[PDB]
């Protein structure tokens, strides 16, 4: 991505937002068993440890 901006007078960020499906489905099979699976379609965070 290449941006061209009007020069401002102080350091500014460029708040960039992609489009992601950061969805979670909650599995509760039995009593006091709570499990969540997080998945984000463009930008996932699975490190396979």
């Amino acid at each position: 991505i290449n941006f061209e901006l009007d020069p401002m007078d102080d350091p500014t960020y460029v708040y960039m937002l992609y489009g992601v499906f950061d969805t979670v489905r909650v599995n509760q099979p039995e009593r006091n068993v709570l499990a969540m699976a997080y998945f984000r379609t463009p930008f996932a965070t699975g490190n396979a440890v």
Partner: protein
């Protein structure tokens, strides 16, 4: 004094007294049922999808 039980009789009486302890070295049905119960509910659940 001569009515003191012979050693075999004393052995039988002591074994019978020990059998009613509830604290035998190995698990009876009471103890083994709960030792099975807690191992069943230990570790990752089986029904967790």
């Amino acid at each position: 004094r001569r009515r003191f039980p012979e050693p075999a009789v004393t052995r039988a009486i002591t074994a019978r007294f020990e059998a009613e302890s509830d604290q035998q070295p190995y698990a009876g049905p009471h103890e083994t049922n709960i030792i099975t119960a807690d191992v069943v509910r230990s570790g990752p659940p089986p029904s967790a999808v």
